[PDB]
């Protein structure tokens, strides 16, 4: 009630004391509506004039017992002070106490503090400040001390409950203030300056609304406990597997066969210190910092002649890439899980150990990197969705008019809007035609067209303004930005290379007519609208990380530079200044954190760099994931209501097309009128017989076997086929027989089904096309025209034979049906993506067209300093003198819009982006030699692109595809769309294991000793003892490392033997206690198998290590010990549910894996046929190439995760000399030339990654669905 505004006076204090006495005699929740920091309820009405900011009697009766008063601030915000004497000296009625209170409650105080904080945050970005930047810091400390004392006097220090130190944000503020003055009294500078960065966190306290969402993030992280435990346990198990398999394998090196001066390996080793001396005894590839790895197997890296493979030296990458110890193995497994530069570890491990070890990487990538990531992603979505539901529920609870009318009628008509839309489309198309080597006539044409288009747009601007005037004109959002853009274009015409690219933003006018572009605009608007606070918190966190990194490691990056760059100058990615620190932080957010952290370690210590990088990665990824899921769910759920009718007032484009179709109908009718005025029994039984035969299971199985054989016979066409002279001819005749069989099968399909029932079927059309290609090739070969240009090139289409299995295998057929169903929305989103990326491609063309050229020394491939050879004329003058000098260009660049699209793809997938970025930031001009970081702030272009065209775009696509798959499932009627009919019932049967009721306790033995043993073995104490024993065994396994002494080996062996005997004893006890009931429990039979396998492995490793000599077999069979630590799952209710979800999801993942394997097989055959002879450079190697089916499959599995695809594509973009030799002779084969085909390479390597991306999103759908099912039911 309004009357309830009495003051806090002597009588009020007396009443409060009486109520406290009443509460003491008596010896609940306070009113939420009157909680401090919230708006005043509307019941109380307007605050009386003279009572603003005055100590008022408590407005909540809950506090009527205690001594507390309320002060009301303009804006209806309730501040709850404390009535107890402040500091025990002052009291609420005091000349100073009231003043301090009103000061703290006022706004200007808050604005002043925020301004000071944000000025300090600008001064924190100076790596070395001038000497005068001490008065400013003194001013800042003075302002902070004044604020602290004001708060002290306003609300007491620690006297009562409502005081200074109650608020957690006060603990940070006071802990800073004390450090500042304490440090000044003291006067490691780096640590003292780092402690100043805590002043940035006060932004969260001052800026309204950031505190609540920081609390929301802290509450959301608490849901990721089970997931984190499972992740740590899985990474530990995989790290143990890796530490067992590849212990010391990365220390392999090629050592000289012949030495001199009686030098042995140890003598040589104990002298070398520098790389120029290491290079004299080990094989180093040109321009490599690490000795070439080798292996002792038949499928490992091979050393040159005169070099022998030995295990000695240090591990690659400064020594940080190793499996020798558990810590390094865990780091490597975390890197594999996060899929950061994992292809390098993949290649190193395969070269060192053997190519048959890619199974380990397959399992790790498809079990830990793609599944444990989905559990984290799924859990946060469930945690956010629960929060959002609660928020929704809580919310629920004279001459001028003559021209004016004429112009309005002229311009405000449907036709003009469509004309302007076509004008926008044509202007963008015209702008897309720019390229580097552009002749003067083409440049003039482009300039004239741009002038015409800007003139048209300015004309319509003036026409519309004069039509409706600027009072009514400036009320429309589209009109505002249209005016902005035309003004900018006029400014550019009157006057650089950026303002010309601002007309590209007119493409967003098509959002009105384009429903799925309005979704992108809505996402962008939400990111700075409803979720603007979350975006601001992300920005603040990134700024804090950049400042912390700079303060910690900037001095070291400069002092220890020669440890990371042999030129003793800073590398490309460092932390010596704020811009580069921020770039490193942004790169870590993008997902590349190991290459930039190796140098961090080398310069400034492993502990510090690891702590900082782990904090940055975890917290930044948490915030980015929260923002992504918030945007996704909010934007794609807000419109579900259909709150507004579909185009109530039809859009001008819609009206224009309506008029156009009406006119077309009128014209058609008039023209039609004018022209009309002016002027068997046996055959049917045979058909039935063929139907019977072709519908038979025997026939289907025979044809499936033939399909498998004919597809497998394609894998024998390696480059080594000429050595296999018998297999050659065997496969030729087998191909002929397969063609005959499939011709007969197609003829029977005809004679059975009919020319309509057969040719109205897509599977039948596919089979018909394949067999027709085979028949055409066979006829041409038989007639003698086998090598006839396009006829010969047609033979390469035999890689499509495996496609015949989709129609035969129901598992793949079901998933193919889902993809075919989802295609339309995919196409819509791809269209929006292409339009959005066209803008950035054009802008990149305008910024970087032709500026990627450079004059390089072809021996070491090093750019010449710009002091000499500063331009292309001087590069050619130097060419005429020297010989190994080239004016080279990047193969992927921004010379035109197509290559811009390719470069943007490489940037958005983060693979070639560094190579492109270095050239972009070095670019000077056209025909000018690049200078180092001449254009340093070009990094902002790539930052802004990686945000807009690779985060919001991915958000839009994910939302669209999720909605489409939900719609498909709803159409099927709540049926899983990735499971076959047979797998559905097995899935349902498996589901029951998650809801079984507990079974009756096993009856006790009827024997005097057996009963006691049962009672002992059926105890929680026994279970806990076994669990701790398993943990101790795990620790014993972890304590093992490479280079350990024989005593350590012996003690570890004996400890493991003791553990084995203890577990066998527990097995025996459980046997004699539970009798035959024992084997009715699945976990107990698992324990039995684990125990027996541990004993067998222990007894068999001795045989493999005493008579037989097979280290690989010994290492593989020693993996049976991990079955002892896998038993930790049994007592973990938390992770058992998640592994059950995985087991339930397996049936759907099997089909997708089968389809992915089929696609990989097809692409492997195509790669074998096409890229078998390209020049070996960049990512194509002696081991990783397309010379053989195994190598092709290795490369394709690698690039399935989108890793190194730029490196595999680069050697194929060479198609002219001197890059490739078109007439190179390959010994043992008739093929000539090691050149690649750029178009085929681009198509291959783009289509494959797109298809793999679609399959990967299919897997996340399956995993998310199963996780939700298991979590709910």
């Amino acid at each position: 009630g309004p009357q309830s505004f009495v003051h806090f006076t002597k009588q009020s204090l007396a009443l409060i004391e009486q109520r406290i006495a009443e509460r003491k005699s008596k010896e609940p929740k306070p009113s939420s509506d009157l909680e401090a920091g919230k708006q005043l309820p509307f019941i109380y009405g307007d605050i009386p004039p003279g009572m603003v900011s005055e100590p008022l009697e408590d407005l909540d009766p809950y506090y009527a017992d205690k001594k507390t008063f309320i002060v009301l601030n303009k804006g209806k915000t309730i501040f709850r002070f404390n009535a107890t004497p402040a500091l025990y000296m002052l009291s609420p009625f005091s000349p100073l106490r009231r003043i301090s209170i009103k000061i703290l409650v006022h706004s200007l105080f808050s604005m002043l503090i925020m301004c000071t904080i944000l000025t300090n945050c600008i001064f924190m970005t100076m790596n070395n400040p001038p000497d005068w930047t001490k008065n400013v810091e003194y001013t800042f400390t003075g302002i902070y001390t004044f604020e602290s004392l004001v708060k002290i006097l306003a609300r007491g220090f620690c006297v009562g409950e409502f005081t200074f130190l109650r608020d957690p944000w006060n603990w940070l503020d006071f802990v800073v203030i004390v450090f500042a003055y304490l440090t000044e009294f003291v006067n490691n500078v780096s640590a003292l300056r780092t402690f100043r960065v805590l002043r940035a966190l006060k932004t969260i306290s001052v800026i309204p609304g950031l505190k609540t969402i920081v609390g929301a993030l802290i509450q959301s992280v608490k849901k990721l406990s089970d997931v984190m435990i499972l992740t740590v346990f899985c990474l530990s198990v995989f790290a143990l597997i890796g530490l067992q398999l590849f212990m010391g394998n990365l220390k392999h090196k090629c050592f000289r066969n012949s030495l001199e001066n009686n030098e042995t390996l140890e003598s040589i080793m104990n002298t070398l210190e520098s790389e120029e001396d290491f290079r004299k005894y080990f094989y180093y590839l040109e321009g490599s910092k690490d000795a070439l790895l080798c292996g002792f197997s038949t499928d490992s890296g091979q050393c040159p002649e005169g070099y022998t493979c030995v295990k000695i030296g240090r591990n690659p990458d400064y020594g940080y890439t190793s499996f020798d110890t558990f810590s390094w193995a865990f780091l490597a497994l975390f890197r594999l899980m996060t899929q950061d530069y994992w292809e390098n570890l993949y290649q190193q491990t395969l070269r060192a150990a053997g190519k048959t070890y890619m199974i380990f990487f397959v399992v790790v990538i498809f079990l830990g990197s793609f599944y444990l990531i989905n559990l984290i992603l799924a859990v946060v979505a469930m945690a956010y969705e629960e929060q959002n539901q609660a928020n929704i529920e809580e919310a629920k609870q004279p001459y001028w008019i003559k021209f004016k009318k004429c112009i309005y009628f002229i311009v405000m008509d449907p036709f003009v809007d469509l004309a302007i839309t076509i004008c926008i489309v044509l202007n963008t198309l015209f702008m897309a035609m720019e390229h580097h080597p552009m002749t003067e006539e083409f440049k003039n044409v482009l300039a004239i067209g741009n002038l015409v288009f800007t003139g048209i747009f300015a004309a319509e601007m003036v026409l519309k303004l004069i039509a409706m005037d600027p009072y009514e004109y400036f009320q429309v959002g589209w009109n505002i930005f249209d005016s902005l853009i035309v003004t900018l274009s006029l400014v550019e015409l009157f006057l650089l290379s950026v303002l010309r690219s601002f007309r590209l933003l007119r493409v967003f006018k098509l959002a009105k007519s384009w429903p799925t572009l309005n979704m992108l605009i809505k996402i962008i608007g939400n990111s700075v609208g409803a979720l603007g606070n979350l975006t601001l918190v992300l920005a603040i966190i990134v700024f804090i990380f950049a400042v912390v990194g700079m303060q910690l490691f900037g001095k070291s990056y400069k002092e220890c530079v020669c440890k990371i760059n042999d030129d003793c100058t800073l590398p490309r990615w460092h932390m010596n200044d704020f811009f580069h620190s921020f770039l490193i932080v942004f790169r870590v957010l993008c997902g590349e954190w190991i290459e930039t952290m190796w140098d961090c370690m080398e310069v400034a210590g492993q502990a510090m760099c690891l702590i900082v990088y782990m904090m940055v990665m975890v917290i930044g990824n948490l915030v980015v994931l929260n923002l992504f899921l918030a945007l996704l769910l909010s934007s794609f759920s807000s419109d579900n209501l259909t709150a507004i009718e579909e185009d109530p007032d039809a859009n001008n484009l819609q009206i224009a097309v309506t008029r156009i179709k009406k006119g077309i109908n009128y014209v058609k009718q008039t023209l039609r009128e004018f022209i009309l005025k002016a002027f068997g029994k046996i055959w049917w039984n045979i058909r039935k017989t063929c139907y019977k035969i072709v519908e038979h299971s025997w026939f289907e199985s025979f044809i499936v076997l033939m399909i498998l054989l004919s597809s497998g016979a394609l894998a024998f066409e390696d480059i080594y086929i000429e050595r296999k002279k018998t297999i050659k001819i065997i496969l030729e005749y087998a191909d002929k027989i397969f063609t005959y069989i499939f011709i007969l099968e197609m003829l029977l399909k005809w004679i059975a089904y009919g020319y309509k029932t057969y040719f109205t079927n897509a599977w039948c059309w596919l089979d018909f096309l394949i067999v027709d290609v085979s028949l055409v090739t066979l006829v041409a070969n038989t007639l003698g025209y086998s090598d006839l240009g396009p006829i010969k090139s047609l033979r390469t289409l035999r890689a499509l034979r495996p496609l015949r299995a989709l129609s035969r295998f129901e598992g793949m057929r079901v998933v193919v049906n889902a993809l075919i169903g989802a295609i339309p929305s995919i196409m819509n989103v791809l269209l929006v993506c292409l339009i959005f990326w066209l803008i950035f491609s054009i802008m990149g063309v305008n910024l970087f067209a032709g500026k990627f050229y450079e004059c390089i020394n072809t021996t070491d491939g090093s750019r010449f300093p710009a002091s000499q050879v500063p331009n292309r004329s001087e590069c050619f003058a130097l060419m005429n003198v020297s010989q190994n000098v080239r004016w080279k260009n990047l193969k992927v660049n921004f010379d035109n819009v197509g290559l811009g699209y390719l470069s943007l793809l490489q940037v958005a997938t983060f693979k070639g982006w560094t190579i492109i970025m270095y050239a972009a930031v070095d670019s000077v001009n056209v025909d000018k030699q690049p200078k180092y970081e001449y254009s340093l702030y070009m990094y902002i272009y790539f930052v802004v692109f990686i945000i807009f065209g690779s985060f919001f775009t991915l958000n839009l696509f994910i939302g669209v595809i999720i909605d489409n798959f939900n719609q498909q499932k709803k159409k099927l009627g709540g049926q899983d769309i990735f499971m076959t009919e047979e797998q559905k019932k097995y899935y349902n049967a498996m589901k029951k294991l998650g809801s079984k009721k507990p079974q009756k306790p096993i009856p006790r033995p009827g024997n005097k000793i057996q009963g006691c043993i049962f009672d002992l073995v059926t105890n929680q104490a026994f279970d806990i003892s076994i669990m701790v024993l398993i943990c101790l065994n795990m620790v014993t396994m972890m304590v093992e490392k490479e280079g350990q002494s024989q005593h350590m080996t012996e003690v570890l062996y004996w400890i493991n033997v003791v553990f084995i005997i203890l577990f066998t004893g527990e097995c025996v006890l459980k046997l004699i206690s539970l009798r035959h009931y024992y084997f009715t429990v699945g976990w107990n039979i698992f324990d039995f198998v684990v125990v027996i396998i541990s004993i067998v492995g222990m007894f068999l490793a001795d045989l493999i290590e005493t008579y037989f000599v097979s280290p690989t077999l010994f290492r593989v069979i020693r993996l049976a010990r991990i079955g002892r630590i896998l038993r930790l799952v049994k007592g973990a209710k938390g992770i058992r549910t998640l592994l059950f979800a995985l087991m339930m999801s397996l049936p759907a993942l099997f089909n997708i894996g089968l389809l992915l394997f089929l696609v990989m097989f097809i692409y492997a055959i195509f790669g074998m046929s096409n890229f078998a002879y390209v020049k070996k450079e960049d990512g194509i190697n002696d081991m990783f190439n397309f010379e053989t089916f195994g190598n092709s499959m290795i490369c394709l599995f690698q690039i399935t995760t989108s890793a190194g695809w730029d490196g595999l594509l680069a050697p194929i973009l060479n198609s002219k000399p001197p890059d490739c030799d078109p007439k190179k002779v390959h010994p043992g084969s008739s093929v000539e030339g090691d050149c690649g085909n750029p178009s085929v390479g681009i198509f291959y390597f783009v289509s494959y990654i797109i298809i793999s991306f679609l399959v990967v999103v299919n897997m996340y759908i399956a995993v998310i669905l199963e996780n939700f099912s298991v979590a709910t039911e």
């Binding site: 066969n257 001819i729 027989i737 010994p1227 084969s1229």
Partner: protein, 173 residues
């Protein structure tokens, strides 16, 4: 690429035969300076007599009557790093039947290291008057034809049986 394709072992009298000797290095990116020597032990003889030597892009033929004016180089050309060391007989007679030997002397050039290695490849050549057909081709063609006829017969038998059953059932109906 580099594939060590084994040489053929059958030459037809009067025609031209190419004797194959390919030697690929373990790592293709290394540098080398190779040269070769060929030795021939005619059938009925027990001594390997050197017949030619090739080095620095010049073939030095020995004064052998059996090979005078009947040998030309068919190896790697235009380089000192030879990996193909074949030779060509432009007119094959009966004196070219026997065991051959292709010596390869490869000298790798490493960083502060030089390795002088050597290889030997043995080729046995028999001269005939007519070119015999490959037994693998014979068996492959015969197997293909028998399999084709077997499949056709089996399908026809199944068609006949199914049609007779269908006609019997139809007449029953």
């Amino acid at each position: 690429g580099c594939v060590e394709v084994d040489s053929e072992t059958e030459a037809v009298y009067g025609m031209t035969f190419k004797i194959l000797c390919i030697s690929c290095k373990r790592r293709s990116e290394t540098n080398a300076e190779t040269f070769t020597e060929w030795t021939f032990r005619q059938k009925g003889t027990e001594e390997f007599v050197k017949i030619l030597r090739y080095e620095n892009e010049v073939l030095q033929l020995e004064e052998d009557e059996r090979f005078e004016g009947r040998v030309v180089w068919n190896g790697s050309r235009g380089t000192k790093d030879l990996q193909d060391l074949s030779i060509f007989i432009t007119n094959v007679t009966y004196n070219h039947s026997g065991d051959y030997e292709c010596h390869v002397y490869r000298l790798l050039f490493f960083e502060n290291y030089e390795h002088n290695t050597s290889v030997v490849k043995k080729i046995h050549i028999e001269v005939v008057d007519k070119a015999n057909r490959d037994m693998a081709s014979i068996v492959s063609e015969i197997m293909m034809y028998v399999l084709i006829v077997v499949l056709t017969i089996w399908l026809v038998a199944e068609m006949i049986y199914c049609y007779k059953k269908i006609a019997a059932a139809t007449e029953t109906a």
